[PDB]
């Protein structure tokens, strides 16, 4: 469910006709389920963002805040960016992620999937600003 269910949200991004499709089926039965699907997914899928809780992916998603495409995402994974400050990274991010790390993310592939989910969260925040 972390690896998948985001392509559903990507299909939900475009095709406002799909927003129309939701309406006929709903009134046959609007804060639709369609946008409201991944809420628990957004809770628990981004557990292992990076180093489980580190949130260098926070700065990465800050980099992705341009409606960046997939090739742009791969380029940005080629770029890379992270920090190890003694600020509130400690208790929330590091001192709960590495204790939480039953298997810590140690690869560029993990950061690649993390920043892909960051671009997914960027599109989701665009959709949420559409809802509010």
């Amino acid at each position: 469910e972390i690896f998948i269910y985001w392509s559903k949200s990507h299909n939900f991004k475009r095709e406002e006709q799909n927003f129309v499709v939701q309406n006929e089926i709903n009134n046959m039965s609007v804060a639709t389920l369609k946008k409201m699907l991944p809420i628990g997914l957004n809770m628990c899928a981004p557990t292992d963002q990076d180093l489980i809780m580190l949130a260098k992916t926070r700065y990465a998603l800050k980099d992705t805040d341009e409606e960046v495409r997939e090739f742009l995402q791969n380029n940005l994974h080629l770029q890379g960016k992270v920090e190890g400050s003694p600020s509130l990274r400690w208790q929330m991010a590091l001192y709960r992620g590495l204790p939480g790390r039953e298997e810590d993310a140690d690869d560029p592939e993990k950061i690649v999937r993390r920043v892909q989910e960051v671009s997914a969260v960027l599109y989701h925040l665009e959709q949420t600003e559409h809802p509010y």
Partner: peptide
């Protein structure tokens, strides 16, 4: 301390909500 929290694994740890006496 964050370890003493019984649950804190649902609603805040990934979601910005902060332990009160953290620092």
């Amino acid at each position: 301390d964050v370890s003493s929290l019984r649950f804190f694994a649902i609603c805040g740890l990934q979601e910005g909500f902060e332990p009160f006496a953290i620092n």
